[PDB]
Write a protein that binds this ligand. Structure first.
Ligand code: NA
Ligand code: NA
Ligand code: NA
Lengths: 254, 249, 255
DNA sequence: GCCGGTCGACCGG
DNA sequence: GCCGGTCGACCGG
DNA sequence: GCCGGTCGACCGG
């Protein structure tokens, strides 16, 4: 992680920050420009490393004028896994140009990208409302994570990228929201066999950053293989539980 | 529908109206509610607004048990009730606020009949996938409660689509669509399991040819739900298991 | 490949070359970029006449030099390869009435367009697509024909004898004639056989764009055949199931 | 030319 | 301490 | 995405 080395500084700068409330306080809509606040800070203390996912792509393509077309542009990633996780559509990659750059995309894997010496850190910011105790938020697609681990193995890319999370806690205070806490955690540091997969909630992994464990002490290849086992096991578990919950109780009506 | 009769009045006040740019379409939902609250004052209610009034019109009714009785309907209670603790802890000093998962955005009630209005905003500047409409699971339970309690003329679930786009420093509505759930072919509703088990469709394209009974609608959907759930149990193996069974070992 | 070492020239001679619009009519089927194929042959012969035949043309030469060989048996035995037989031999009645006064002709269903051999055979098949429109992958070759080819390859063990390559010639309308703007070369036995798509409805044909065809297969030619069959069989079973769920159930309500 | 995955973040009738 | 639906609305490595 | 349907005509261990 490029952020961890200076986390204590981010936590310090965030605690106390305020943001004008939408004037609902729930939902992706009433999210938190707190992530914009994180970006602004990472852009200041790590300007040569901080990139919005769409910002990195625009940059990558800008320094390759001779390379045109999606085919030629995809090879620019020089990594099948990073291509899977960062890339944009075919027509979008084909139609890219100086007067038609990439913009924010709702389903982009990462909020902030940090690159240094061919090493990428996919950071995803999670904002939480402390005023209440809610369910763990969506972290990342368990299915997308499964494909990632599959591609890591097939390509032997166990030393290239990390997927980290930064949780920023806030509470209402008058006519604005105020940050009260923060917490950092790396995905590949937790126990892969203990990640809860909420199938209904877009097959998303879920947990509050402040609770995640960081005791995994094996290699990255083992983490991937272990995750895939847990993923396949849970997929079969869901397939069976769906019948007992969405079929059995409704057969009497047919 | 209590809105169908004035759909053109709602559309006329929406199309062309601009709002200062900063969900992003929320501003248009407030315009609908405000309109209804001024043209159907005695029928328009925010879901949480209805609950407070209901509880406020019966102060001598304390406790979750007695309060849950106030709905006089199992199906409606399932669709509108908040929570046991929330229902118990309710008070004139601790009212019900809006909740992200409330079934409806707007409630129109009259003659003991309820209309659950859910309005969907859409950025016409993009050609996206069909949005989430309503949980297929929540619909199934609802249909089950309709059968067990024989409530086929109590409520309707309708959707209003508000199309908008960014124009300069403002947002502007460009078109509107209306449709009724119980008027579409239940066996045709697409159920996106991964997407919160929600049924998805563009209000604009939603068919309205159904001419059967409300009971037949309920039974039909339930059959469609079960079958799809079974089919999904198979799809999961062929997509989330079979292709990864070569890494486990 | 024999033309591969000379692909640069071809790619350069083709691009820019133009041909009038086929009878000023439609631009599909056999009548569209057919003349281009001729242009490719006009070069592969004017620079490699030592080993460039147009399918039937070779067959005409395979004979003649064997007058004592007539009517089935001997004539069918001429091909010391059961595989090359299945991919180049004409009909029985056709390989009977052969003579100097009745030479073979170009047949619409011939496997290869141009044949280059030098013991080792290269079955070249040209492809042309209107780049002025995003279209579907064209029919490459018969999946069934390829399956029989692989089987026969294993049986008599001939994992070294012939190659199946394709040459793409992209063209676009320009005035009263069509012009080439690009070219793409690829070799069938160099891609992932388990990846090849089989369109059963489209004549059980393998479909893909020469330009996008991969060329990185790890293994011998033998491993390919083994691999393909495993793939072709699977798809066939899948097709059998798909048919019932699309051409049977959907209309079972009308009977 | 049909089909469906992803991001965001919420409590318990 | 553990389990898991619901709303919103997005295009094609 | 991935996935696949059409029009035009041809002869045969
Ligand atoms: Na995420
Ligand atoms: Na809804
Ligand atoms: Na062919």
């Amino acid at each position: 992680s490029f952020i961890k080395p200076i986390y204590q500084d981010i936590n310090s700068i965030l605690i106390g920050q305020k943001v004008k409330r939408p004037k609902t306080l729930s939902g992706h809509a009433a999210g938190e420009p707190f992530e914009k606040l994180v970006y602004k800070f990472l852009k200041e203390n790590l300007s040569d490393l901080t990139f919005k996912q769409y910002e990195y792509l625009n940059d990558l393509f800008m320094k390759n004028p001779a390379i045109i077309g999606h085919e030629a542009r995809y090879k620019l990633f020089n990594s099948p896994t990073l291509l899977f996780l960062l890339s944009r559509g075919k027509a979008a990659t084909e139609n890219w140009s100086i007067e038609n750059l990439f913009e924010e995309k709702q389903n982009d894997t990462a909020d902030i990208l940090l690159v240094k010496d061919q090493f990428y850190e996919l950071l995803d910011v999670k904002t939480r409302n402390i005023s209440k105790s809610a369910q763990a938020p969506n972290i990342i697609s368990a299915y997308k994570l499964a494909q990632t681990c599959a591609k890591m193995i097939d390509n032997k890319e166990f030393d290239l990228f990390d997927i980290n999370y930064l949780e920023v806690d806030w509470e209402l205070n008058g006519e604005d929201l105020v940050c009260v806490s923060t917490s950092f955690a790396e995905l590949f540091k937790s126990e892969p066999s203990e990640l809860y997969i909420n199938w209904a909630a877009a097959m998303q992994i879920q947990f509050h950053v402040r609770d995640l464990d960081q005791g995994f002490n094996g290699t990255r290849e083992e983490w991937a293989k272990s995750y895939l086992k847990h993923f396949v096991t849970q997929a079969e578990q869901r397939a069976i539980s769906m019948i007992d919950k969405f079929v059995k109780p409704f057969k009497k009506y047919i």
